[PDB]
Amino acid sequence: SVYDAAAQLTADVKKDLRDSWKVIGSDKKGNGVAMMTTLFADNQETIGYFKRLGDVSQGMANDKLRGHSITLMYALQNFIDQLDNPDDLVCVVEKFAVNHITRKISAAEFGKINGPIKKVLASKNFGDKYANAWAKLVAVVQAAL
C-alpha cells in the first residue's frame, strides 16, 4: 500500500533524494525536457498517451511539451518538500495519482520513468546510489496507481 511504500523512504534515501534534487531541480526546464525526450526515445510506446502534445520530437521547440515538462518538475519538487512528513507525502501522492489513474496509467507504465531519471542523474554525476533512491520515491506513486 502507499503507506507501507512511504515507510521505505529511510533517512539516507531522503538525504540522497535532497542532495540530488538540489542539482537536478536547479534547471527544471532543461532537465524536465531531457527526462521526457529520453522517455519517448527509450519507450516509444508511451508516446500514445501524449497525443495532445503534438510532435514530441521537436523537444524544447514544442510549446506544449515544454509546458508539460516544466510542470512535471514541480510535482517532484512537491514530493521532495513533503519528505519530512509522511502523512503529507501520502496525501500529495494520492492527489497526484488521481489524474494518472483516470488516464489508465498503470504502476508498470509509470515505472518506465525510472530509466529516464537514472540517465538524467548520471548526466550530472549522480550514480546508481541516487537512481535507486529515486526508484524508491517512484515506488510510492506506483503503490497509489
Of these, 14, 18, 28, 112, which contacts ligand HEM (CB under 6 A)? 112
Of the candidates 142, 141, 140, the one whose C-alpha atom is nearest the C-alpha of residue 7 is 140
Secondary structure of 42-82 in the HEC alphabet? Answer: HCHHHHHHHHHHCCHHHHHHCHHHHHHHHHHHHHHHHHHHC
In whole angstroms, the minimum distance from the beta carbon of 12 to its own copies comes to 25
Q: Tell me if 94 contacts ligand HEM by CB under 6 A.
A: no
Spacing of C-alpha 83 from chain mean position: 15
Cα(137)–Cα(9) distance, rounded to whole angstroms? 7
78: partner contacted, choices its own copies, ligand HEM, none (Cβ within 5-8 A by kind): its own copies
- Judged by beta carbon, residue 86 or residue 105, the one nearer ligand HEM is 105
- The response to whether 68 counts as a known ligand-binding position is no
What single-letter amino acid sits at 98? V
Residues 4-43 that bind ligand HEM (CB under 6 A): none
Cα(19)–Cα(66) distance, rounded to whole angstroms? 25
87: partner contacted, choices ligand HEM, its own copies, none (Cβ within 5-8 A by kind): its own copies
Q: Which residue is nearest to ligand HEM (CB)?
A: 99
70: partner contacted, choices its own copies, ligand HEM, none (Cβ within 5-8 A by kind): its own copies
- Grid cell at residue 28: 527544471
- Judged by beta carbon, residue 54 or residue 127, the one nearer ligand HEM is 54
For the chain, give the longest Cα–Cα distance: 41
Chain positions contacting ligand HEM, by CB under 6 A:
46, 49-50, 52, 68, 71-72, 75-76, 95, 98-100, 103, 105, 109-110, 112-113
